[PDB]
Structures are given as C-alpha cells and as structure tokens.
Amino acid sequence: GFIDDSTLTGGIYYWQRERDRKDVTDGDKYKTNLSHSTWNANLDFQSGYAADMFGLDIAAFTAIEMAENGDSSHPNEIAFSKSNKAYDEDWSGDKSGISLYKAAAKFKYGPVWARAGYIQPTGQTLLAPHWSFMPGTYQGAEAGANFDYGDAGALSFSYMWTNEYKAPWHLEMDEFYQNDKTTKVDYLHSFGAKYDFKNNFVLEAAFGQAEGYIDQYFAKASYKFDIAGSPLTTSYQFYGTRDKVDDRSVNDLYDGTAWLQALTFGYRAADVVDLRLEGTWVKADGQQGYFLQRMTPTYASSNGRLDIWWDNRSDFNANGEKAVFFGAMYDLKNWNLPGFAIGASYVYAWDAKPATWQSNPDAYYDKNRTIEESAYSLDAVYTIQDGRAKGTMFKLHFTEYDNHSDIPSWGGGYGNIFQDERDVKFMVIAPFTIF
C-alpha cells in the first residue's frame, strides 16, 4: 500500500579533516591541503506502491560548514562547492546549502521495474553516483527486470539513460561534455546484467556509452567457498574504456582500449579479523595517462561503477601501474569491546607510467619513465550498541601516502598522481527513522 509501506528516514553527519601535501617546488613543505569541519543532514521519503505498481521517492540533504582554514583547497566534497555546476568549477571555495537528491516516480509490473526523475543508478548497469555521505543524482530513467529460475539461478538486467548529473557537492545539475568542456555529450546510457547461479558463483557485465565519445565496459566474476567453516570470497574484475576521438586533439584521451583489471580475496579469520588481499593492473596508453571508470573525463561530471576502493588516497590507476593492497580489520568483541574495531592497511604499487604523449610537456615529462607509490592507513571504528543512539557510528582514519618520485603534484605526464600526503578524517554518522 502506497501509504502504509511508506518510510521516512535520515541522518546527521559530522566530518572533520586535516590533510597536508608536499610541495616539492617550495622545499617540500607539507602545506595545508584540506582543513574543515562540516555537518550534513538528510531526510529521505520512500513511499509504498499503490496497487503494487506506483510509488514516489523524495529526499534532500543539507551541508553546513563549521570550520575551514584559509589555506584549505576546494571543493572539499562534503560541503557544496561554491560553483553550483561541475563545468563551472573554479576551485575557489565551499559553501552551505540544501540539495534535492532524489525525486522520482517508481513503477512495478510483474518482473519489470522502473524509476524516473532525479535518481541514483540502482540496477545492473555501470553508471554510478559519487558518494560523499550522500550520493550524486542523475536526471533520467532506469528500467530493468528480474527473472528467478529457482535452483537454476536468477537473471537481472537493467538499462539507464541520463542527460544531466550533479555530484553531492554540486547544488545544480550540469550536462555532459568531452574533455574540452564545450563539445556536448548528449546523454550517457548503460545496459548491464547479473546472473546468480545460486552456488555462490555470480557473473556480472555491463556496457555503457557517452554519446559520440566513449564506450565503457565492465565484467566481474565472483565465487565464495568455505575454508575452515568461513567463506573465502574471490573475484576477478575487468573495467574497460575506449574513446571515439583519436585525432590528437584535446578530446583524445586513450589510444586503443584502456582498462583496469583486478583480483580480490577476502577472508574472516578466527571469526574476528576481516582480511583483504587485492591487486590491480592498469593499461592506459594515450594522452590522459590513467584509467577512468566514468564515461566523462571532467572531475565531478559523472561517475561509473568501480568495486575496488582501498581508502589510501591515491587511485593507483596510472598507465601500466600494478598495485597490491593488504587490509586487516580487527573486531575487539573478545576484549569485551563489542562495536569497537581497529584496522590497518598498506598499498605498494609499481610500474606507473605517464601519458604516452603530451601537447605541452613539462620539465619532468619522460615518456619511458616508470615510478612507484605506496601508502598505509590506520582505522578505528566504534558503533553504539544499545540505547537512544543505537547504530550511531564514530570513525577515525589516518593515511600516510608516499609518491616515490619528486615530480610535483599533477605534473610530469602523471595527471592523476599527487605528492606525499598525510590525511586524517574523523566522522560521526547518526541515522534515525521517523517512520
């Protein structure tokens, strides 16, 4: 029933960050890169289905700046950028505001479903929003279907079409453009599918396009099996992208197909420590020099599905780059501290190459150089177990990041690699239900 199955939920969020980065042009001074305290709050209405076919979802969030040092850079991605539209971004500030982030009619008819309006991708395609506390928002529609074949498996597939987007730090939607920020991309769309064989084997794949510009690929195979009574989870993931501009203009991003391949292992040992072993390998020949899982190249302009996230500041996505991640998350419940967990992680990556050509090379550009990067992070988490504030979570994250070069940040033909950093994030997440 439309009314009786309605839910209204939300949260209060607090984020405080101090990040400094090495300026190898000013004597390696670790300068303030981010320093701010910011609140978010959201309210999210989800209706039931009238006649099990017709529903509505509406949700909004606010960001309130609390503190920000004058030397912190922008946008910090928790407040709103001072620039309301992504393609106007000029990196000059941040501001408070209110954004409508869901506003959609939803539909169901047998095995088919659809949503249209201000939406997040929700099916099997490779479109994705950015996530801060809240998600970004697409203007468009998605429709898909679910077919259950009992023990023989289950098939799901969906299609999404969109012509505008806003990241959670943009108050307004913008259209899509090529790398020059002026040649129009009329839409993004994507089709994908998932087959679950109900034996812990699962296959997923999707294709997407940016109109006139980019073809995007995704595939993933996952498998779980028990060792010592606990599942070892494994997956192989492939992400691919090809452009349609190979004239060596500013819009020519990739030579051939660029891709990112990954293998992941996960295992919970002694029922108390979550372990992660992951590796990635990137090919990205051409002018850009790094792999992007999104189909529009401009920062904040759209996003795409990428199931690999190591929270170690760098993306480890340069041409040629190989990288290995080890993480451990230790639940302290047997010290009688249920809800307390501490963790640590480490990344080492090598063979990172630059763009294979540059139009205005800088002093440090050398087509055949290779470099290395590494990082380690520490994590502490507490979730309130009982009472008024049950589920309220406190998190503390520290990262030390090391560029194994003295190439200045964003330079040398490594357009997505920056210099040594120290990063500390403290966040509080306080969900609530009104009904």
Ligand X SMILES: CCCCCCCCCCO[C@@H]1O[C@H](CO)[C@@H](O[C@H]2O[C@H](CO)[C@@H](O)[C@H](O)[C@H]2O)[C@H](O)[C@H]1O
Ligand Y SMILES: CC(=O)N[C@@H]1[C@@H](O)[C@H](O[C@@H]2O[C@H](CO)[C@@H](O[C@@H]3O[C@H](CO)[C@@H](O[C@@H]4O[C@H](CO)[C@@H](O[C@@H]5O[C@H](CO)[C@@H](O)[C@H](O)[C@H]5NC(C)=O)[C@H](O)[C@H]4NC(C)=O)[C@H](O)[C@H]3NC(C)=O)[C@H](O)[C@H]2NC(C)=O)[C@@H](CO)O[C@H]1O
One-letter amino acid of 328? A
Bridge partners (DSSP) of residue 403 are: 373
Cα 166 off chain centre by? 14
Taking phi over 0 as left and psi of -120 to 50 as alpha, with beta for the rest, 287 belongs to: alpha
Task: State which residue, 47 or 99, has the beta carbon closest to ligand Y.
Answer: 99
Query: Using CB atoms, what's the residue nearest to ligand X?
Result: 97
Residue with smaller CB distance to ligand Y, 160 or 417: 417
Cα separations in angstroms, 133 against 40, 120, 429: 8, 14, 9
Under 8 Å between Cβ of 324 and 279: yes
Q: What is the DSSP string of 193-233?
A: EEEE-SSSEEEEEEEEEETTTEEEEEEEEEEEEEETTEEEE
Footprint (CB under 6 A) of ligand Y, residues 312-351: 315
- Binding residues for ligand X, per CB under 6 A? 60, 97-100, 171-173, 219, 238, 240, 256-257, 259, 283
Identity of the residue, 47 or 179, whose beta carbon is nearer to Mg ion in the bound complex: 179
Tokens 């505008």 belong to which residue?
164
For the bound state, the minimum distance from the C-beta of residue 339 to Mg ion, rounded and expressed in Å, comes to 33
Residue 73 touches which member of ligand X, Mg ion, ligand Y, none, C-beta under 5-8 Å by kind: ligand Y
What lies within 8 Å, CB to CB, of 10 at 6+ separation is: 41, 42, 43, 44, 431, 432, 434
For residue 410, the SS3 value is coil
Q: Which of 49, 131, 326, 364 binds ligand Y (CB under 6 A)?
A: 131
Which one of 109, 149, 309, 335 is in contact with ligand Y (CB under 6 A)?
Answer: 309
According to CB under 6 A, which residues from 260 to 299 bind ligand Y? 299
Size (the chain), residues: 435
Say if CB 194 and CB 218 are below 8 A apart: no
Rounded distance between C-alpha atoms, residue 359 and residue 356, angstroms: 11
Which of 56/423 has CB closer to ligand Y?
423
How far are the Cα atoms of 90, 205, 279 from residue 236, in angstroms, in the given order? 38, 12, 10
Query: What character string, x for contact with Mg ion (CB under 5 A) and - otherwise, covers 371-410?
Result: -------------------------------xx-------
Choose the binding region for ligand Y from 21-29, 125-133, 213-221, 252-260 (rule: CB under 6 A): 125-133
- Interface with ligand Y includes 373 (CB under 6 A)? no
Residue with Cβ nearer ligand X (203 or 332): 203
Stretch 140-179 residues interacting with ligand Y (CB under 6 A): none
Site string for Mg ion, 38-67 (x = CB under 5 A): ------------------------------
Residue from 73, 234, 257, 383 binding ligand Y (CB under 6 A): 73
The CB-of-134 to ligand X minimum distance in angstroms stands at: 11
User: Could you tell me the two tokens for 64?
Assistant: 């309130």
Shortest distance, position 229 Cβ to ligand X, whole Å:
30
Nearest Cα residue to 264 out of 223, 218, 322, 228: 223
Tell me the closest approach of the beta carbon of residue 76 to ligand Y, in angstroms. 6
- Determine whether 298 is exposed, middle or buried from the number of CB atoms within 10 Å of its CB (0-12, 13-18, 19+): middle
132 counts as binding ligand Y under rule CB under 6 A? yes
Query: Of 44 and 420, which has the nearer Cβ to Mg ion?
Result: 420
Closer CB to ligand X, 297 or 320, in the complex: 320
**Alpha carbon of residue 338 to chain centroid:** 29
**Cβ of residue 90: shortest distance to Mg ion, in angstroms?**
16
Is the CB of 2 or the CB of 87 nearer to Mg ion?
Answer: 87
Touching Mg ion, residues 295-354 (CB under 5 A): 299-300
- DSSP assignment of 280-293 equals EEEE--SSS-B--S
Cα 221 to chain centroid distance, Å, stands at 20
Phi, psi of 370 (to 5 degrees): -135, 145
CA distance 225 to 201: 9
Q: Between residues 212 and 256, which has the closer beta carbon with respect to ligand X?
A: 256
The partner in contact with residue 424, picked from ligand X, ligand Y, Mg ion, none with C-beta cut-offs of 5 to 8 angstroms by kind, is none
Write down the least CB distance from residue 17 to ligand Y, Å: 8
- For ligand Y (CB under 6 A), the number of binding residues is 12
Nearer to ligand Y, 183 or 416 (CB): 416
Residue numbers at the binding site for Mg ion (CB under 5 A):
299-300, 402-403, 420
> Which residues would be at the binding site for ligand Y (CB under 6 A)?
73, 76-77, 91, 131-133, 299, 306, 309, 315, 416
